[PDB]
Write a protein that binds this ligand. Structure first.
Ligand SMILES: Cc1nc(C)c(C)s1
Lengths: 394, 396, 394, 394
């Protein structure tokens, strides 16, 4: 919590630890023992609750509609469990990534721009964290409200089902007694914890991407005066200064590439698993939306599920696309300087930089796809086409 | 000497598309332009208009619609090719003349590899043109002139005893009556004239495209030989000026090949677009007809001969566009293989610009929509299959 | 209306203002007050009539065919409303774009080519404007004729419907009395104004693209003799002349890049919304075409709707593809000169220009797609595939 | 036997020869005659059983489910026969490929890394061979176990079908002890031989790819110190040393390119055939999976068929993708060295190397596609979408 890229992300790390994302690395050793226990307990509770959800699916599988809804809920709440189990097994690469920017470069002429863009990156990270936290809080509040405005009724004949936020089978009578209130509190805690863990891991990924993009912006901004520094023949001191500036630019670009590669290695399998779960969730959600008739409770629930799923996918894709665009635009920033008035060494440096920028940095889901607005467009088109086919067939 | 596209030149002359085809500097003349426009309008009156009138008037089911659509698709595409190539005659003739000039330049070389290339290209051109023209002329003759053969056979065998009421070729509706013998004979004569013109158009223009692609490939191989000579010269350790001059000449040859490819693309863009659009439907309709009347019938024979013709017609353009693309691409590999590391950094930068240009994809687009490659053959084919399945669903 | 790129587009700006596309920027201040009012009034009327269509769609939703037809009409007439509201909110970026070419570059040797290509661009812009205006007028006339040749009858039994160009519910008796003629004139005005506003904004976008393409053509044309100027050792004056020529070429290319970026910024969301509305329009139109049997009026109306929608898409895609092709062909232009006889500086200039031209400038719909003939082909194939699925499944 | 690329792959060559895969080139002439007959006999037996299966497909052609199952089996067992016949006709190119690396370049400075990466490649080849052999043995054992546990019964009434591992019409009784045991032994031998033949040819292809990838890794690793050797205004000795190092690098890269081209020719035609068969196999398998309802034997068989097909495709695709990424990484490693400190010759060498590496090496199925994880993704998406549509149609 002192070195770069962890001090900057410290609020995110603290949130992750608070909700139970393990992370026994960035506090005093004294807290290592108690905190760990808490984390384990949370996981247990999560799995515990998850268990009674799965059981509820087993005896609710007679019909198709209830089975579909239970499966959608199960995938929705499988997401956070997968993320929570995924982090500790791959904690080594995560800690390596968080320590990548502990020793960056420095040049006297470009220090001010570096500081400015670092501050900008920190502000953007905090803004993203707050926005995602607000979205999670709004989702939880909406869930709690909707479970109450709606009528808890089961169609068989009319059977009073317990008024609970999440369908679940409980050994005790969770209808009117103290079991009801206990189930309410437990389900509220489960919802908050699961949503928070999932969104916190996602925000950590997106904040890594934000840092990389701001570093690319700094690289372009300082590319602008580097050529002017070279152009002016040149004395030995001036040639040495140009060489040092070129070295700084190239080494910082290599550092950004290293950070991007580390992030990709850390999160590729997570992205692949997320999209694998999503595909099925969206298929079942298209089937569910096929049955929407009106502006009643069912339509609201289906729209909320679709919005949350597509929002997760869209967040990943927007930040991936931002990285791609910045990496590509490095080339335009290299072309837009007065390279024709520069020296031969500077012109060769510009040529090689453009050569390298011919291809844009991107994050891939374990080499099966890439995260970009194109991926989100493809997912949305696939779900819409499946919905249209489902409407036509019936 | 002028054997460049010799058989294609003969086919074009037989079309009256070009009058003095066998010249070394084929000249564009307005007389040929207008004569070819009149000959272009002959098939429209004889074939396209009557068949389309029948299609939009007398068609009474899906089977009849598909039967009428089997020949008319290719007839309309061939008329379109007539018009397109008449419009582009200037570019086509300029391309042929430039290919002839390049061939004359190459034939002056003393290297045995180049001479072997020239002989192989000439043989390939001749064989391909002959085979393609023969196959498609036979297809058209089988489709159009069968009743005449049947009448001749019946007259020879049964004499005047048996009766065989002759009927016109593929169904059509005519504004004027054809019951009278004289009108019937004149209509059949003009139908045969239009069929001959269409067959020659299809064969000659497809063979022209394929043969020009072959010659472009040969010129690329000559450029490869020149690059290998430059590499050997680099190894031999000569002066900077000699290597500079050799690289300049190689660059000029590369530019000439690129210009030839550009002219070919300009000439055949819309041609290829229309060809693919038509083949997508033609293959499907011919396959459906084949499955509808499979058996020991004349219709089965005609459809079985027709289907490979259309499939190979599509594959011709796909394959030769792929050849253009790959041959253009391999120049970067040919320039990388020479020992450029032995050259002064200036010549290395010249080679780097050469390779930067040589890596850009090149080929013939389908009217700017996409570049044509071998994979396209799958795409269009798959599309055809789609339509085919659709038809089946409509029947049952 | 005195500086570049606004005097060139002045007929388009005047047409936009006359049809009510706001634009309170390019006339005397005295006209600012009255014209504005007129614009507002136009919008009101539009919305008014639009509302009366939506009302008509509420009680016409009992059937499926009439509901589909009403939805197609509502989307068709939503296009112009969306564009008309879109312009004023984004007027800042539009005005920034129109003022981009106020201070362009100049070199004595390339002045004649610059002027020639500028004049060619102006002529092409005028031709495009006239062609689109003629197409719009033809569409209006065809609508006004088809409303009359057909028989105004409703199937329930036969109910005589009012003979109006656009289906609509009117509080007054718009069948035989003065209400009929008033409704006819009002609908004629609505059609003319809506088509005019939509097509005028589209033509402005396409005129920007045409200007960019003509500037690229000028760049290549002057690239041809630039090397001849370089190749000729060289005295100081000649070296300075080559430096000035290279500076001119690079700066003009960068100006074209800036213009393309500004146009994309201005119109990306507009393209995205246009394609969003189109997709649904084409889906409903495929369903409508599924019911075509004969050469009657219904077939003519369906064909007209399809032709208009695909024509808008095709215009956008044509000009996007033209921009892409010109930007790509810049490298073919750069290679075809005698770049090997030039000086070292000119050779590095050609090298870097080719590296930059490895990629082609394009306009994207808010980063979700690019405008090209490939996009038009994909849309056409999608609608054809949906029609095939509709006919097969039934 | 005593030359590169055949001494490294010798165990795979011996495994290929043992199963009856021709290859009469890498042993003493004494075994040249005997082995040949064995090979022929194997083919005969294979063909025999193959024909023996095809005949059965006729009798069971009346029904549609058994027709689909028999077609799937026929394609599965078509794969190995196609490979076995394909090798001898193209044996000359295979032998040319196996003789590519007999005389590789050598440099004193890069000998240690070359030896290390050669040993690494040999180890990875051995690991791949052992893994694929274990997978094949497991497949055979699971097949036999499935046949023995599952009930052999035919639905017409229940008619007891012979309990044989592969459906086939036999002149023998196939029910009494002698015929039953003979058929079981023959089918076990047939399965082992077919699986071994197909998988061994595939493993040879993938081992070629592994060698190419390891050579590329060696090229990058020794590229890193090459520039530091160049970087230091050099004495003639240093200039000559740098030239020799650059020559070694370029020649080794060209050698790798030649190897990739030969492998591409041979197994590109092979891959075209393989994927042409796999497409139909996967379509029929999706139709079969549409009928799964939790039954152990049926679901297990369908899952096994899908797993085997997708595993073959995935193996080809993973190794192709590794080759592509290795070439792109050659580009990246060229960028990420101290070229700014080098001499103009070294900088130009880096520029040309990066320009060449702009286009990554790949293996194409006869120019109809490229083997990569993108191809596997396309195959999986197509089959999954087809299955979804099919199950909805039911
Ligand atoms: C069946 C066919 N008849 C003609 C005249 C063609 C060009 S094709």
């Amino acid at each position: 919590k002192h070195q770069g890229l962890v001090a900057d992300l410290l609020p995110n790390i603290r949130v992750m630890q608070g909700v139970g994302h393990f992370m026994f690395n960035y506090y005093s050793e004294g807290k290592k023992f108690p905190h760990r226990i808490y984390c384990i307990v949370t996981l247990l509770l999560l799995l515990l609750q998850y268990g009674m959800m799965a059981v509820n699916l087993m005896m609710e599988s007679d019909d198709v509609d209830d089975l579909t809804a239970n499966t959608i809920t199960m995938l929705f709440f499988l997401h956070p469990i997968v993320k929570m189990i995924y982090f500790p097994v791959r904690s080594k690469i995560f800690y390596k990534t968080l320590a990548i920017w502990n020793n960056p470069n420095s040049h006297p002429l470009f220090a001010e721009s570096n500081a400015r863009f670092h501050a900008l990156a920190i502000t953007k990270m905090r803004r993203l964290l707050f926005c995602v936290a607000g979205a999670t809080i709004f989702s939880v509040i909406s869930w709690t409200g909707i479970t109450f405005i709606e009528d808890s009724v089961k169609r068989i004949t009319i059977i009073p089902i317990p008024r609970l936020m999440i369908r679940t089978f409980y050994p005790f009578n969770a209808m009117s007694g103290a079991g009801h209130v206990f189930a309410l509190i437990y389900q509220f805690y489960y919802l908050v914890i699961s949503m928070a863990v999932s969104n916190s891991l996602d925000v950590l990924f997106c904040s890594w991407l934000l840092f990389a993009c701001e570093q690319l912006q700094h690289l372009k901004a300082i590319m602008k005066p580097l050529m002017e520094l070279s152009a002016t023949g040149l004395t030995k001191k001036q040639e040495m200064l140009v060489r040092s500036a070129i070295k700084y630019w190239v080494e910082r670009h290599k550092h950004v590439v290293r950070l991007v590669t580390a992030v990709g290695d850390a999160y590729g399998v997570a992205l692949l698993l997320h999209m694998l779960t999503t595909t099925i969730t969206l298929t079942l959600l298209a089937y569910q939306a096929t049955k929407v008739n009106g502006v009643n409770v069912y339509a609201a629930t289906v729209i909320g599920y679709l919005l949350y799923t597509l929002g997760q996918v869209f967040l990943f894709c927007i930040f991936g696309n931002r990285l791609i665009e910045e990496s590509s635009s490095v080339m335009e920033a290299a072309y837009s300087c007065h390279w024709y008035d520069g020296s031969e060494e500077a012109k060769t440096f510009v040529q090689i930089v453009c050569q390298q920028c011919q291809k844009a940095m991107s994050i891939s889901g374990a080499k099966f796809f890439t995260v970009s607005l194109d991926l989100f467009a493809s997912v949305l088109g696939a779900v819409v086409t499946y919905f249209m086919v489902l409407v036509q067939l019936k | 000497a002028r054997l460049v596209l010799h058989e294609v030149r003969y086919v074009l002359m037989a079309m009256l598309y070009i009058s003095r085809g066998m010249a070394k500097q084929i000249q564009n003349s307005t007389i040929d332009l207008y004569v070819y426009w009149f000959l272009t309008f002959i098939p429209i009156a004889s074939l396209c208009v009557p068949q389309f009138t029948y299609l939009v008037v007398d068609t009474k089911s899906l089977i009849d619609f598909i039967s009428v659509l089997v020949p008319i698709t290719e007839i309309l595409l061939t008329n379109g090719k007539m018009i397109i190539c008449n419009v582009k005659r200037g570019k086509i003739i300029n391309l042929i003349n430039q290919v002839q000039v390049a061939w004359d330049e190459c034939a002056k070389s003393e290297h045995l590899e180049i001479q072997t290339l020239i002989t192989a290209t000439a043989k390939k051109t001749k064989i391909f043109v002959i085979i393609y023209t023969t196959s498609f002329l036979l297809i058209c003759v089988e489709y159009s002139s069968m009743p005449l053969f049947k009448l001749i056979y019946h007259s020879a065998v049964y004499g005047k005893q048996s009766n065989y009421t002759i009927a016109l070729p593929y169904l059509s509706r005519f504004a004027y009556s054809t019951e009278s013998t004289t009108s019937f004979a004149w209509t059949y004569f003009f139908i045969l004239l239009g069929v001959y013109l269409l067959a020659l158009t299809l064969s000659g223009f497809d063979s022209l495209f394929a043969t020009l692609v072959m010659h472009v490939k040969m010129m690329f191989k000559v450029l490869k030989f020149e690059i290998e000579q430059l590499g050997l010269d680099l190894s031999a350790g000569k002066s900077h000026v000699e290597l500079q001059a050799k690289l300049k000449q190689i660059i000029l040859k590369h530019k000439t090949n690129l210009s030839l490819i550009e002219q070919l693309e300009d000439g055949f863009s819309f041609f290829l677009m229309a060809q693919f659009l038509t083949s997508s439907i033609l293959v499907c309709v011919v396959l459906y007809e084949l499955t509808m009347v499979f058996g020991w019938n004349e219709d089965t024979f005609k459809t079985v001969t027709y289907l490979p013709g259309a499939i190979l017609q599509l594959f011709l353009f796909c394959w030769y566009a792929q050849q253009i693309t790959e041959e253009a691409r391999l120049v970067s590999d040919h320039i990388y293989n020479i020992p450029w590391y032995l050259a002064d950094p200036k010549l290395q930068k010249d080679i780097l610009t050469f390779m930067v240009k040589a890596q850009k994809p090149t080929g013939v687009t389908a009217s700017k929509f996409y570049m044509v490659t071998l994979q396209t053959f799958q795409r269009i084919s798959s599309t055809s299959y789609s339509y085919f399945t659709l038809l089946q669903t409509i029947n049952q």
